[PDB]
Each structure stands twice: as C-alpha cells, then as structure tokens.
C-alpha cells in the first residue's frame, strides 16, 4: 500500500510545511457527535504533516552523521523509519524518503509493501518532477502549477499503488503522457 | 494474631451497666454514653467521677446525638420529635427539654409542600448544625431546619424521590455523606441523589454486583468505598469509581496547528512533535511506567449477629459491631485495601458505644467500663509511643489502670 | 500556589513556600506541592521542598500531611531528600505538640 | 526549490478573504459556464491552491461546487480540466453534501477520477460499499479493466470483504487470465498490473494454469535490470512468504528457493537487503544459524553498517518477530549483541526506538556483567568503526564513509602494536568473556570522540541502559546484585570522554544502584571493604560528586541492627566516615557534607558509646557550622533526635509498612 505521496521542504543544517500532500484514501470513522468534516479533515492533515516532520528529522540527522559529500542518482540521502500508533496512525506504517536539494518526497507505505520498490519509484518520480516541471529557480511552478504534479502522479502512480515498470512499459507510459501537455 | 489490645481510659462499674440499654452511642468528645432501654427510657451514662445515670422516659424508639464531625433529638410513638439537652458539668447528670414538635404540625408542614400523603412513618437520616434530614413517608426527603430564635421547622428543601411508588415506599436507609444523599431500596438499588438539588445524580446496581434485604449500607467519609450489610449478616464492599466505570451502563452521571487539531480530531489523537530526540523520551516513559463522584458534585459471614451495623468505614479499613447473648460481643475489623479481617470475642456483659465522631476505634463498654479495642499494638509498643510522644506520667497511668 | 507548578522557577518558588508555609491554607498548599513533586530533578529543589514540609511540621498541621509527606518521601529523586521526608513525617505522626518543639 | 514567491503564493492561498472567495467563486461561475479556454485552467489552478493549502474547511459558495461536480459529469471537458476537478473533489472531502454519483461518467479514465473522488469520503454514509458496487457494475461489461484495477486494489485495502464472493471469484479469474511478459503490448500491460498488487490481493483474498504460470510468476519477477532487479527481488521473496502463509506447503518451497539462492545471495554485494525477507520467512517458516542468520545478526552489521535503510530492515525484522522467537533463536540473538550495537553506533536515529523494545527480549543470566560494559563502550565503538573505514578504503569510492576529520594521530595509533588486541575486542563480533577497561583506547580516541556519529550513538545509551536494568532489576539474584554493584563502583569515573555521556550513565547507574539497595537492604553490609575504601578516599568525592551522596546515604541508613552483621562493623564504618568527614571538611558538593553529617549522626545512634562521640565531634561540627545551611541543619535529626535513646532506637530502623498510606492509624489507638 501507499497511504500518501508527498512533496515537502527540508531545512538546512521554519516549520516543514508540505507543499503537496496527496492522501490516497480514507479511514473508517464513530464519535457520538455527528460525523463532521472539520474533524476528519484536520486528522488527515495532521497525520501527513507529522510524517513530513519525521522525514525532516531523519534527513537532517542523516546529513550531519554521514560524512558523504556533506552539503546525482545514488548520491542523495535515503532512509526509512516506523511510525507510532495513535501518534497519529491507527495501523502502524513504514515511512520511505529520498531528499533532493530541499524537496524531500516521501511515501507512507503499509508494512506489506516492498521497500526497494518504494525507494526506486520515489527516485524515478523525483527525477520526473525535477525535469518535467523544472522548478530549480521558479519554485512558484510547484504551487501555482500543481496540475503538472497531479498529471505526473495520475499517470505513474494510480491510486496509491506502485508498479514494476520496466524499459518497455516506461516507454509505453512515455508515449502516453509526453504530448498530453505542451 | 488479632486477639486484642483492650485498653481502658475511664472506668465504669457494672452497677450502671445493669441499668443501661443494649445499644449506645458516644460523642466524639467524652460528652455522654446514651443507651436505649426496651422500656422506652433513655438512659445516659456520663463517661466524661463515679458516673451516675440519667433517665429520659417516653415512647421513644429513635434518636441520634449531635454528630459534629450532647444534644439528643428523639421522636416518640406519636411521630412527635423532641430535642432535649443534657449538661455534663461537674458530673451532674442533669437534662432539660428544649425543643418539641407535634404530629399535627409535622403533617401540616408536609401538606404545605403540596404532598398529598399523610405522615405514616418518619425515619431519621442525620442531625448536623441543628439541621435534620428526614425521609418522610419513606418517599419525601424533607430537609428540616430548627433555626435560632425558636424559628419554626420549615423544610428548606422537599424533593419527592424521582422513582415510582412501587419502590419509593420500600426504602430502608437514608445516609448523608458530604451531600451525596443515598436512599437504599430493599430490592437492591441505591438511588444516589443530591440534597442540594434533588437530582438523581447517579444510580448503583447492587443486583448487578452479583441475597436480598439490604438492611444498611456504610459510606466512607470520602465517598470512596461503600459496604452494604443486609439482614442476613452479609456485607459486601465495592469501589464507587470502579463500580461506576466497569459497568458504565448503569451510571447516569507545526507545533500548535496539528496539536490543537489533535484536541479536536478526536477519532484518535496524534502525540505529535515527531522528532528523533523526543521519541526516546516516549520509550523511557513507557518502560518506566510499565472518580465516580466527580461528576456528582471478600464477604463477611461469621460462620448470626443480631444487628450487623458497621461502626465506620475508612478508605482502607472497615470496623463493624456484632453482639450475641450466647457468647458475648464479636467486634470485626476489615481492611479495604489488604482484604484482612480481625474478629475478637468478648464477654457477655458488653455493648457498643457508637463514637459519633472521628475516633473510629471500637469503644466497647465492658464490665469495668470504657474500653478502646485496637489491633497489633503491644503494651510495650503503645507505652513507648506515648513516652516518645510525652512524659512518663501517661505511661504510668496507662500501665497502672490495668 | 496559584500556578499549577510546571514552571522552571520552581527552585525559586520552593524557598518562599518554605519561608511562609503555616496552618492557614492547607489544601491549596498541599495540591501545589503535590504538583511540584514531579518537577524536582536536582538536589536544591528537593531540599527546598522538604524545607516546606519542615515548616508545616513546625506549624503543627496533622491531617493530609500524613499523605503529602508520604508522597514526597515515596516519589523524589535523591535518596537524601526521601530520607529527610521519612524522618520528618515520622516526627509529625508520632509526636505530641510540645515535644516536637522540644525534640525536633 | 524554495522561492519567496512560492511562500507568498501559499500564504495568499491560505488567507484569501471571504469576500474575495465569493468573488472568485462568481468568477468561476461566469468562467466555467462560458467558453472554457486557458482562463479555465488559469483559474482552476488557483482554486486548487487555495483549497489545498487550508487545513480548516473552506465551504465556498455552492454554485462552484455544483459546477465542479457537473464538469466532472460533463464529457466535453478536456483531460487536464477533468483531472484538476477530480483533484478538487478528492481534496475537499469529506463533505456530507455528496451530490456526486457513482455512475455519472462513461469514460473509464473519468471513471477512475470519479472513484478517486468518491473513495476519499469515508464510511460516514456507507460510501465505500456504493463505490465498490458501482465499480463492479461498470466493469460487468467488456473491459479497459487495467485502468480501474488500482481502484479495486485500494478498495480491498480499505474494505476487505465487500467484494462479494461471486465478485471476488470474478476478480480472481480476471487476474489469472491477466497474468499473461516479464521485465527481464496490451497483454504485458495487464501483466504489469497483475504483478503490481499480487501480494495485497493474496493477503486480502484456470487455477491449475494459475499454478503453472502465475504462481511461478512470483519468482519470475526475479528468477523465472539492476535497480528494478533489486526492487523486484524483495517483492518476489515477500510474495513467496505470503504463499507460505496462505499455503503451508509453500513454506518448504520458499525455504528451498532461499537455500538455492544462498549460492549468490550470501556472496553478491549490493544484494544483502533480500535476506531480511528471507530471514523473516525462516523465522515464520530459522535460517542457517552460522551462515545466513549468522550474517544477519553479526556478519552484515560489521561490513555494511553505513547503509541507513538496510539497518532499519535488519533491526525491524529483529523486533517484529520477537514474539515468535525460539530458544535457539533466543540464544543466537543473545550471542551477538556487541555487533548488533554497531548499527546503533552508526544508524541510531531509526533503530534506537526499536532497541528499546528489543533489549528486554535477549536478557541472559550472566551477560549483564558484560552487557553493561558493552553499552558503556558504544561511542568508542562508533569511533573504532570510523577508523576502520579510514584505513581500508580506495580513494576513488571513498564517498561512502567519513574521512573528513582528524586522521593522523588515531591512524598512527591503529598501527601502534600497543593496542592490537583491545581494538579487536571493542570491534568484536562476539562477547564470550569480559575484557579490560577502555581507558587506554579512550586516550587513543581523544581526537575523534567528538564526531557527529559518535555523538549520535551517545544519546541512545541512557535509554537502552534503563531498558536493560528494568529487565534485570526484576530478574536479579544475589550474585547478579553484587556483580552489578561492583561494576558501577568501578565504572563510576572510567568512561570514554564523549561530551554529555558520563553525566547520563552516572545518573542511571547511581539511581539504579539505589533500586538494587532497596531490593536488598544488606548490600551495604556485604560490601564493607569496597564502600569503606570509597568513602575513606577524598578522591571519590573529588571525582564522583553525584554518586558519593548515594553510597554515603545507603551506608548511613543501612547499618541496621535488626545474621551476618557484627557490632564492630558499625564502628569500622564509622571510622571510615569520620576520616572522610575530617578530610573533606569537582570536589565534594554541598550535598556530600549534609549526607556525611546524616550518615555519621545516624550511624552513631545505633552504638551506645558513639553517642558521646557525637556529643564531642558531631556537636562540634554543628557548632562550627553554627547548601551550607542544609549541612548545618541536617545533623540535628540524629543529634537532638538521638540524644533520647528510646525514640531514636526505632525510627531509624522502621518497619516494612511506613510507605503505604494506610498502615498506622490504629497504632495511636491505644489510649
């Protein structure tokens, strides 16, 4: 599974506020108070924000205590973690990250999902977002142009599921999406 | 090893014990020891020397001394309530009658509250600060007040029991414990009402705790533990907080932005500040660490006591009284937390004296007189503690008196 | 005693608490001290706190203190403060009023 | 990256005025019903930004909401607008005003968009069942079905049974026919989706042909092209383990497959991560205790401790199947703990919140006397591994290490034959006998003991110590108690000088030796010589300023008259205390003075003669005194309160029940 895909800022060795928080599902919810919208929205927002903070902590601590070119495909920081029930998830989940520059994209995946596939897919997606959208100066192209991100994930990441795409199948999806936008 | 520690801090000859009643009650201070004779005469043995007896004659079958945690108030056969004052100045067992109430006036006061019921029986519940609570007709909890300047007895509150007449007339005990007025119905329920407002603030399912005929129930002075003694010499004690929660069906009683949302997202609630330095404190705390009345603002069977009326119940202890003609008086002590019992057998000429106060140690009137029964205290240990507390004169007195 | 007792200036509060505690306002002081018990990690505050308890000792307060001193003795950090509380709790629980002023 | 213009756009999207919001909704109304051109997208993007970046609900004018819903229901809309509207309705959720429907658009991609709109609601109005049934009905005709399969997968992720048995078998046969090439056309296009959710499908939920082709397709993802190969090996092993779980006979098949793979999986660098699922499969269905499990416990962490994700996998396998641990597995995990400590040295942040659970799960009878030292020498373990990296790496690849600090002294000391055996014990893969004090190696590793990674490892030792003690404080006997006491008495001032390390090990060890003493009061009695030497030395109070208080308090209180005690031991201990008090009066703090007064005056009230000694010397110390105020005042509690012997004889040796809050109210009931 993948509960959500993220793009969030990463501080340098200012709160970490998710620029793009796509939640790929819902959770069962019953309080005696009638089922509202404020409660559910605030829950499904604070969970993702907490995951973003945890990935920021992991990335920063990895940066100081790695020594690997302190401050590039396999040269970016990578790692994994595990969450805490009721702080704030129901079913506990693993968190996968791969930070580039200052845009740490994360994946909240269930314990019955492949880790190596998660890291490979997050790598390919962050390459695609760095190139197709090219926000390495006009960062406004990431918030006012959220439709590009929406298109990219809706093509490659259908409904919180990871695919074992290979050269021929990536060629097929490249034939699919390349011309859909100018 | 619970035989006795039977001390005696004042003597009383058996000449008066041949004249006193079968049950008695003592003030917190040594003010009197009044006992009820079967002939209706109220005998008061002043154990405040020589100790002569005073007699109060009438058709009295219920009374209670002024328990200010002696001013005796009693109701006759004609449902006429009287208040007589006894003064123990210099050993003079002299008494005077201060306040009297007639049955016609009581019915008039009951009717003036729009209660279309004739007073058939009045059972007392308390007498504090000249204010008396009475469960009139077993249904109307009329809180009388006999105020200063000979003001008439007017009910400052009169709330009918929020229950049907099917169980309203089957009430037994009316106990006031810091305002949580409990009325016990003999069928096995305790409708905890509040004398301040009258609401059915809660309800306790004594039946769900699983005999019958709950004769009396004792409330701890902190409203913490309640023990109900039926007419079958059986007492069961369960915790109010646990007995209201474990069966709650019967109980009718970036930094901030995500944190306050954790306060209002109540499906779950984060625990959020999700670093990798304050997530170790959580592990440390988990490893290290690994009531009911707030909203309403084993079993004792001695293998038959006549009147198994527990004297008082504290947070961690419970003391009871049992008297039998065949063998004498059996005094019981139960530890609420430790679940231990100490039962001692005494002589056949001895009756309890309910210390209507703070000292809940069984002060049994024995043949020689006053006798405070304790547990576990050796004579050497007790006298040593007195000496470590005061002079040797007290130790000499307590060693010589026996 | 107005504050719940979660401040970092507890080491400065307890000094006044000891210098002023008496038998007038019991329950509020006991509640404040009970709350502050969890916020004492260094020996200095753990001695100011029992200075407060000793002040109550000298005042003569009897009831409830059999539990405040008990909880302090049972739930502090340094052994010396806990033994201090044990001794002072024993002194209040087993002494008559004058002998405490003459034998404590 | 992060432009201030981007931050301004986000702040504007968050704090858009209500009147401005109404104006924007009106613009959307007049602009969507009109000819939707580039203005349509140029406004929809801003609408998405202003709705997404607001946590609190934004229930704008209804007309906009119905316009978006109808646009989703309007087939003439382009792909861009349809996707953006689907995001609009999949982010604004959950609303109780779900005017949408589950059969409002015929297009299959638009059907996927509608499903994404619907599923983000929740079970507040029975939605998920409706969406699942509608998807099944829409798929009941010819399908294609490949685009909508992810919605199916997510639904079964959130709803395990609403797919009816007939519908479930329909999905099963569809997937089986959809199985078939491999990574190493429309048919292969559906094969990719068939592989992409096989494990979840098996967990939540022709068949002979299924066993012929698709059942072997799990390994065919790997066996039957480099990074995806790594990403697919783990999936293959996990799917094999899932088949073992759903089929007991498959456990032996997967075990045999792992044994066959052991030719290379145990010898191919860069493929070590595939053994963690193999280890899990062996635990749920035990691997080679020497080769496979041996590498998993002690082989891997001594060679590849610098990969922060591999270490998480290893220790998470260790802490996720501790419940199903076996006796032999327990012995194995109890054998190689110094090597498992390598990960905590190198990869502490993602593994300590995991050792806190693991540590009480491998406690042995006698390993504690060495395990405390293993925990004590952990920052030095990190520093030794860092030197190991600096002295074995080709300069070309050396980026996967730290060679960016003070090398020369430590590297020279590595080749210095004075320290050729102690390092081979600190860096050991095993602990089968205690070693010497790390003071020499501590002086060796002065230059690096302040690395970032060593400082990281230094912060996970206190909590692990607490876990270990709380697992042993409840599992101790006499020999263990005495050994631990001696261990702390030694290690008090014998620690690696990593900043802010000894200040925590001191606290834990002292405040838990207190716990041991309260577990057995006779610790001070049986420990005459060591404690006597310690108190008699001024240097103990001059270098252990916060542990000395504990030992002097324990000695002062636990010299109790009430069968191995002798009357002269009190006098000998009093001699040690008298010498210490005379000599003393980080040096001894204002706490040691008061504790010393307390110990002396409360140890001389158990001796008949020593009361005059107090009146001569402790009275003198009071008079000279007449944290200094506390020192002056403390002694009164056994000078004035021990002048009288009867009261003082018993208070200082109280019974077992002065602590529980109701044990004495009857003891003043004797008047």
Swiss-Prot record, chain A:
Protein's UniProt name: AP-5 complex subunit sigma-1
Transmembrane intervals: none
Primary gene name: AP5S1
UniProt-listed Pfam families: AP-5_subunit_s1
Keyword terms: Cytoplasm, DNA damage, DNA repair, Endosome, Lysosome, Membrane, Protein transport, Transport
Subunit structure: Probably part of the adaptor protein complex 5 (AP-5) a tetramer composed of AP5B1, AP5M1, AP5S1 and AP5Z1. Interacts with ZFYVE26 and SPG11.
Stretches assigned to coiled coil: none
Superkingdom classification of source: Eukaryota
Annotated InterPro entries: AP-5_subunit_s1 (IPR029392)
Organism: Homo sapiens (Human)
A biological-process GO annotation: endosomal transport
Keyword Transcription regulation: no
Membrane topology type: Peripheral membrane protein
From Swiss-Prot, chain B:
Species for this entry: Homo sapiens
Cellular localisation: Cytoplasm, Cytosol; Nucleus; Cell projection, Axon; Cell projection, Dendrite
Organ and tissue specificity: Expressed in all structures of brain, with a high expression in cerebellum. Expressed in cortical projection neurons.
Quaternary structure note: Interacts with AP5Z1, AP5B1, AP5S1 and ZFYVE26.
Disease listed for this protein: Spastic paraplegia 11, autosomal recessive: A form of spastic paraplegia, a neurodegenerative disorder characterized by a slow, gradual, progressive weakness and spasticity of the lower limbs. Rate of progression and the severity of symptoms are quite variable. Initial symptoms may include difficulty with balance, weakness and stiffness in the legs, muscle spasms, and dragging the toes when walking. In some forms of the disorder, bladder symptoms (such as incontinence) may appear, or the weakness and stiffness may spread to other parts of the body.
Section covered of the full-length record: 22 to 521 of 2443
Job of this protein: May play a role in neurite plasticity by maintaining cytoskeleton stability and regulating synaptic vesicle transport.
Name by which UniProt lists this protein: Spatacsin
Annotated gene: SPG11
UniProtKB/Swiss-Prot annotation, chain C:
Signal peptide: none
Function recorded in the entry: As part of AP-5, a probable fifth adaptor protein complex it may be involved in endosomal transport.
Subunit composition and interactions: Probably part of the adaptor protein complex 5 (AP-5), a tetramer composed of AP5B1, AP5M1, AP5S1 and AP5Z1. Interacts with ZFYVE26 and SPG11.
Name of protein: AP-5 complex subunit beta-1
UniProtKB/Swiss-Prot annotation, chain D:
Domain of life, per lineage: Eukaryota
GO terms under biological process: autophagosome assembly; autophagy; axon development; double-strand break repair via homologous recombination; endosomal transport; gene expression; Golgi organization; intracellular protein transport
Nucleotide-binding recorded as keyword: no
Keyword Cytoplasm applies: yes
Subcellular location: Cytoplasm; Nucleus
The protein's role, per its UniProt record: As part of AP-5, a probable fifth adaptor protein complex it may be involved in endosomal transport.
Protein name, UniProt field: AP-5 complex subunit zeta-1
